[PDB]
Amino acid sequence: NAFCSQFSRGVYAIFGFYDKKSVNTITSFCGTLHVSFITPSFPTDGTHPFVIQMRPDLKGALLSLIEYYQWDKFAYLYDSDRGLSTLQAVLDSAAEKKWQVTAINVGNINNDKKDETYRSLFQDLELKKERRVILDCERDKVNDIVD
Amino acid sequence: NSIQIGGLFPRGADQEYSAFRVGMVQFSTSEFRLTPHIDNLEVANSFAVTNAFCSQFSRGVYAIFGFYDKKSVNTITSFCGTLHVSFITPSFPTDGTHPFVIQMRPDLKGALLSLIEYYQWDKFAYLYDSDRGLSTLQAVLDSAAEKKWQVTAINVGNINNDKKDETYRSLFQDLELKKERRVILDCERDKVNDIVDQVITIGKHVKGYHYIIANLGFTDGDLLKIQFGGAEVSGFQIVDYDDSLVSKFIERWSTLEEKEYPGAHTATIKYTSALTYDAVQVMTEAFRNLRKQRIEISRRGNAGDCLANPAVPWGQGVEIERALKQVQVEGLSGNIKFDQNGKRINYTINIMELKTNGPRKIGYWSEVDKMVLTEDDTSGLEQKTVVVTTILES
Amino acid sequence: QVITIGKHVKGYHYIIANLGFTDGDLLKIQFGGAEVSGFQIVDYDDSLVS
Ligand SMILES: *[C@@H]1O[C@H](CO)[C@@H](O)[C@H](O)[C@H]1NC(C)=O
């Protein structure tokens, strides 16, 4: 609605944000109606025309950092909010570079009792004595984990 | 009594639509008739799906049956939730609790994890396809932390098909560094045959390898090829051809003219198509339980534009949901029941193994009983030991 | 048949006893692993044949 509303008002370009759920709506409409969409949100997983992305791809910088510290076995706590684009990145590279990645979706954790979950989270991260963790989350979900 | 409904069929869903037609005939009554308005659009395209939905909504439908992709799924779940429109689909279950959505496909995530423990797997390769969402991928990865597994997940989806050979060779090259002999194929009926064919070519289908087809259509694909190879192949079957109910369906299905009913002249049926047929039955029993319940919901083709702002949900939709979700009949996919959300419950998924004589059910999986093996044990195995007699003499 | 039973993998060695080695389809038992030898009378490397 917000898109069609701004479109009926006759705009020349649209600046906004999208989620892992609404991203497809934007990329699709903007491509059909030839409307330009500028967004700071996470980059689209593919080549969607009429979309300007302010956020650079971190996927590359991350993989490079892992090799720098020479990591072979690490835990990868991810959040499905910005798409599993980076998750697939480390998993696919784990095949080539031969890594033992322990991916764990720290996203679907219900926040009104999220404690017996973290205790059971680092309980699995102790079976293999994981000492190297990668936090792929938002500025908020990170502080929760850090705490 | 004319009940207008919407039908969103992706271009290529021949057998699915054929099964949709047969259902209209088998479940047609004098009390009321269903009027399907078919719209063949590219299910992947989110924009097109939006139009097809608003179009069927302006035409004033009471319910919508169709399909969605990993991309357009959010559009459907969202609109149907806002406009209180019911959406029945055989497609993959939604990752969450989205109201006004009826899902014909049971969750395989549970049956898969149970099978892995049965074979006692600790290190296996997991070739997945991002088409049906990474819902099952997250399942095995999260369980890999608890059950302590060494999973080698590889996205076999983004493989460009106009040169997809130097990719498979480089795929099983990584699956040889750790000498992976146990692979789980989480793909569609098509992407599976492609892999199976490649497997036979490179000769990784001989004794020593173990494949698991992570879909509800184990017998839906061609197995005659990797049947005599030697490698053990397991999978899941939702359409039990041993049920007199299903057996009777095939008796009439296999005879139907393939001209009028595309891809319908076979002894088997894709689980997606079987769910479509069962979908019609659910919609019938639902609209029937509303007539016998003395509930008026009827309207006209003037619901208005779906983009109407503010968008006002027609109260008659709330009852249509409580109807479909309350339905409980017997179909091709076993006992059909639903919860308050729309996810199927109290269902049964047969665990299958591929032997020399062909596929064979070794047990089933219940949401409440986990895995339960049925008779089949080739008892015994030369157990006939040797009786050694001896005397007690130091 | 050889490919079906899987006797075309590394360890097996076949010899096609005819003058037409490239006359038949070899793309099938080419990536199997088993070594395959034969005989060719029509040299496609000759400028005459080429
Ligand atoms: C659950 O499913 C079984 C098998 O179809 C059925 O017999 C039973 O009635 C169901 N249970 C209830 C309480 O509905």
What burial class does residue B393 get, using C-beta atoms within 10 Å of its C-beta: 0-12 exposed, 13-18 middle, 19+ buried?
exposed
φ, ψ for residue B39, nearest 5 deg: -130, 105
For the four alpha carbons of A132, A137, A141 and A142, in that order, the dihedral sign comes to: positive
Among residues B104, C32, B74, B211, the alpha carbon closest in space to that of A24 is found at B74
Nearest CA in chain A to B156: A92
Interstrand relation of A100-105 and B2-10 (parallel, antiparallel or unpaired):
unpaired
Task: Answer whether B340 contacts ligand 1 (Cβ < 6 A).
Answer: no
- What's the CA gap between B332 and B270, in Å, rounded? 11
CA triplet B332, B334, B337: central angle to 5 degrees? 115
Which residues pair with residue B348 across a beta bridge?
Answer: B366
CB contacts, 8 Å: C33 with chain B: 203
Does any ligand 1 atom lie closer than 6 A to the CB of residue B289?
Answer: no
Residue B394 CB partners (closer than 8 Å, separation 6+): none
Q: How many residues does chain A have?
A: 147
Smallest CA–CA separation between A121 and chain B, in Å? 9
Q: Kindly list the residues from chain C whose CB atom is less than 8 angstroms away from the CB atom of residue B206.
A: 6, 9
**Cα(B143)–Cα(B219) distance, rounded to whole angstroms?**
27
Residue B40 Cβ contacting ligand 1 at under 6 Å: no
Please, which residues bridge with residue C24 across strands? none
Closest residue, chain B, to A73 (C-alpha):
B150
Instruction: Dig out the tokens for B170 from the structure.
Output: 């480089």
Distance CA B373, CA B158 (A): 37
C-alpha radius of gyration, chain B, whole number: 24
Q: Give the residues across from C33 on adjacent strands.
A: C9
CA nearest ligand 1 atom 8, residue: B346
CA dist., res. B307 & res. B316, Å (int):
19
DSSP string, B335-386: E--B-SSS-B-S-EEEEEEE-SS-EEEEEEEETTTEEEE-S-----SS----
Is B346 touching ligand 1 by the criterion CB < 6 Å?
yes
CA–CA min distance B126, chain A (Å): 11
Nearest CA owner, ligand 1 atom 7: B335
Question: B175 vs chain A: nearest CA distance in angstroms?
Answer: 8
Q: Which two tokens stand for residue B243?
A: 């049920």
Judged on CB neighbours under 10 Å (0-12, 13-18, 19+), C5 is exposed
- Among residues B119, B125, B155, B157, the alpha carbon closest in space to that of B140 is found at B125
Residues on chain A touching B142 (C-beta within 8 angstroms): 104-105
Determine the angle formed by the axes of helices A23-32 and B73-82, rounding to 10 degrees: 100
Strand ranges (DSSP E) for chain B? 2-10, 33-41, 63-66, 86-89, 101-103, 123-128, 150-155, 182-186, 210-213, 232-237, 330-331, 334-335, 348-354, 359-366, 370-373
Method: cryo-EM
